[PDB]
């Protein structure tokens, strides 16, 4: 199958510079024509930038053109995105596409989030969430900067019956909560475990759930 | 620069029913060469990419189901889905393709009418290591309820607290059209020490209450 | 200035077929457009078929008939060219 993995966001301070990459696979890439669209959050999408299979023609939308600069290196099948002089409107999930005649677009990445802001990178404190007196259980991922975290429970094997909140904004600091349902049989008997990632502080944690409040 | 416009920008419907959007370019999508009109139809689920639907105004990208129809020429275009399920739970995006800049309308948001739905409501104590560092927050789930419009209401020894609390919404879900938030009451460790029974209540039927002490 | 126009256009189709697919599995033609007709991606020794251009003015009495052109087993396309099923009907 066609997959799309883009890589590179993260925090970019205004004015400064930032290179996406994306890695394709599932296809002949030297054959096809790459894209970039981005989307900022909330909102609509934007197509940003072509490159023609052999580097030959390339468009660029007019937010970008001089700014920014397509390539790609097909025997590494992989697309660039060299984004220079980036403003707060810059900011936005970027994705990388394939087209599929008739069409220009067709496959899409998962994508990969770009914020830019003045702000400083802040990693985020992960805190159980145990009842007191089916069961839920929760953690806390307060005080992080930028955006996204990636949080899963007992690494992906517990994956049905999870609530991740979308963060909140505050103090230039996002926090989000996530809940897990599970039987009561299991826990405490066996374990359950929050796993929070933030990649822009290159933070990993595991926090266990420990009963009693 | 061909510029899209997508009405309705949302709009809500039950499990079965049919729906219909529009799309409108400023300019003509049809080449008269080939008699083509440069019409995509992109899905976009909550949280995912987008998923190419239908090419060429008509032609449905394989895997994509016949209840997926899209129809028009020139300058209006429209995409029709029938018997809605719970997945196509989305945000409809209908793009130029004709020429570049390739340009996108600002999409259709497609949600689900749904039987009503009771919140399954759990609240939890500050963690240890919070309070040892300063905080105190207080969280309150309501799971899996419809409609989305609820209320929570925080009680500190049964006076209502409103100062510290913050609420997020999911999307809807994709598979039962439920909603589900979190309210976090975030006090200092001081203020949080100085009393002992803390409860959230939901209503949107009597309100769903839960509770701790200490 | 209407024909010219609509052959640029099918020039421009052609580039964005070829730039929007690939080639069969094995050793095959590269797609062209040699400014008359365009050349899909072919499998070697085969004897390649399009449709008559839809930018010819008389396309409507031609436009169930093909241009032929020959992939040799090398991977490269031949020099000959048979567009009578695209001739103006007069
Ligand atoms: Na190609």
């Given at each position: 199958?066609?997959?799309?993995?883009?890589?590179?966001?993260?925090?970019?301070?205004?004015?400064?510079?930032?290179?996406?990459?994306?890695?394709?696979?599932?296809?002949?890439?030297?054959?096809?024509?790459?894209?970039?669209?981005?989307?900022?959050?909330?909102?609509?999408?934007?197509?940003?930038?072509?490159?023609?299979?052999?580097?030959?023609?390339?468009?660029?939308?007019?937010?970008?053109?001089?700014?920014?600069?397509?390539?790609?290196?097909?025997?590494?099948?992989?697309?660039?995105?060299?984004?220079?002089?980036?403003?707060?409107?810059?900011?936005?999930?970027?994705?990388?596409?394939?087209?599929?005649?008739?069409?220009?677009?067709?496959?899409?990445?998962?994508?990969?989030?770009?914020?830019?802001?003045?702000?400083?990178?802040?990693?985020?404190?992960?805190?159980?969430?145990?009842?007191?007196?089916?069961?839920?259980?929760?953690?806390?991922?307060?005080?992080?900067?930028?955006?996204?975290?990636?949080?899963?429970?007992?690494?992906?094997?517990?994956?049905?019956?999870?609530?991740?909140?979308?963060?909140?904004?505050?103090?230039?600091?996002?926090?989000?909560?996530?809940?897990?349902?599970?039987?009561?049989?299991?826990?405490?008997?066996?374990?359950?475990?929050?796993?929070?990632?933030?990649?822009?502080?290159?933070?990993?944690?595991?926090?266990?759930?420990?009963?009693?409040? | 620069?061909?510029?899209?416009?997508?009405?309705?920008?949302?709009?809500?419907?039950?499990?079965?029913?049919?729906?219909?959007?529009?799309?409108?370019?400023?300019?003509?999508?049809?080449?008269?060469?080939?008699?083509?009109?440069?019409?995509?139809?992109?899905?976009?689920?909550?949280?995912?990419?987008?998923?190419?639907?239908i090419s060429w105004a008509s032609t449905r990208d394989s895997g994509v189901p016949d209840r997926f129809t899209g129809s028009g020429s020139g300058t209006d275009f429209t995409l029709t889905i029938?018997?809605?399920?719970?997945?196509?739970?989305?945000?409809?995006?209908?793009?130029?393709?004709?020429?570049?800049?390739?340009?996108?309308?600002?999409?259709?948001?497609?949600?689900?009418?749904?039987?009503?739905?009771?919140?399954?409501?759990?609240?939890?104590?500050?963690?240890?290591?919070?309070?040892?560092?300063?905080?105190?927050?207080?969280?309150?789930?309501?799971?899996?309820?419809?409609?989305?419009?609820?209320?929570?209401?925080?009680?500190?020894?049964?006076?209502?607290?409103?100062?510290?609390?913050?609420?997020?919404?999911?999307?809807?879900?994709?598979?039962?059209?439920?909603?589900?938030?979190?309210?976090?009451?975030?006090?200092?460790?001081?203020?949080?020490?100085?009393?002992?029974?803390?409860?959230?209540?939901?209503?949107?039927?009597?309100?769903?209450?839960?509770?701790?002490?200490? | 200035?209407?024909?010219?126009?609509?052959?640029?256009?099918?020039?421009?189709?052609?580039?964005?077929?070829?730039?929007?697919?690939?080639?069969?599995?094995?050793?095959?033609?590269?797609?062209?457009?040699?400014?008359?007709?365009?050349?899909?991606?072919?499998?070697?020794?085969?004897?390649?078929?399009?449709?008559?251009?839809?930018?010819?003015?008389?396309?409507?009495?031609?436009?169930?008939?093909?241009?032929?052109?020959?992939?040799?087993?090398?991977?490269?396309?031949?020099?000959?060219?048979?567009?009578?099923?695209?001739?103006?009907?007069?």
């Open positions: 199958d066609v997959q799309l993995v883009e890589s590179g966001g993260g925090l970019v301070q205004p004015g400064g510079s930032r290179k996406l990459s994306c890695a394709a696979s599932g296809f002949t890439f030297s054959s096809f024509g790459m894209h970039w669209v981005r989307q900022a959050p909330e909102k609509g999408l934007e197509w940003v930038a072509y490159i023609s299979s052999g580097s030959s023609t390339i468009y660029y939308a007019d937010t970008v053109k001089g700014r920014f600069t397509i390539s790609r290196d097909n025997p590494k099948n992989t697309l660039f995105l060299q984004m220079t002089s980036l403003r707060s409107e810059d900011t936005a999930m970027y994705y990388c596409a394939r087209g599929k005649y008739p069409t220009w677009i067709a496959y899409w990445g998962q994508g990969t989030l770009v914020t830019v802001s003045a702000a400083k990178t802040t990693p985020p404190s992960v805190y159980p969430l145990a009842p007191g007196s089916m069961v839920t259980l929760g953690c806390l991922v307060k005080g992080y900067f930028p955006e996204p975290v990636t949080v899963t429970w007992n690494s992906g094997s517990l994956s049905s019956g999870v609530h991740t909140f979308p963060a909140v904004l505050q103090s230039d600091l996002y926090t989000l909560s996530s809940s897990v349902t599970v039987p009561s049989s299991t826990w405490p008997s066996e374990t359950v475990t929050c796993n929070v990632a933030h990649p822009a502080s290159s933070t990993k944690v595991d926090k266990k759930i420990v009963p009693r409040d | 620069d061909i510029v899209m416009t997508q009405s309705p920008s949302s709009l809500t419907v039950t499990a079965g029913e049919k729906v219909t959007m529009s799309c409108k370019s400023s300019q003509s999508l049809l080449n008269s060469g080939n008699q083509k009109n440069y019409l995509t139809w992109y899905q976009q689920k909550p949280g995912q990419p987008p998923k190419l639907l029938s018997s809605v399920q719970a997945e196509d739970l989305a945000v409809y995006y209908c793009q130029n393709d004709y020429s570049y800049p390739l340009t996108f309308g600002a999409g259709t948001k497609l949600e689900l009418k749904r039987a009503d739905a009771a919140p399954t409501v759990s609240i939890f104590p500050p963690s240890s290591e919070q309070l040892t560092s300063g905080g105190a927050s207080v969280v309150c789930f309501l799971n899996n309820f419809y409609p989305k419009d609820i209320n929570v209401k925080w009680k500190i020894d049964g006076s209502e607290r409103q100062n510290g609390v913050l609420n997020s919404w999911t999307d809807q879900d994709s598979k039962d059209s439920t909603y589900s938030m979190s309210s976090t009451l975030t006090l200092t460790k001081d203020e949080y020490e100085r009393h002992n029974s803390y409860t959230c209540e939901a209503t949107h039927t009597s309100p769903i209450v839960k509770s701790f002490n200490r | 200035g209407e024909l010219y126009q609509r052959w640029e256009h099918y020039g421009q189709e052609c580039q964005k077929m070829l730039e929007t697919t690939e080639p069969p599995s094995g050793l095959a033609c590269n797609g062209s457009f040699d400014m008359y007709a365009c050349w899909n991606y072919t499998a070697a020794n085969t004897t390649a078929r399009v449709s008559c251009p839809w930018y010819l003015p008389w396309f409507r009495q031609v436009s169930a008939g093909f241009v032929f052109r020959q992939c040799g087993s090398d991977g490269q396309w031949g020099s000959w060219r048979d567009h009578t099923q695209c001739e103006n009907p007069e």
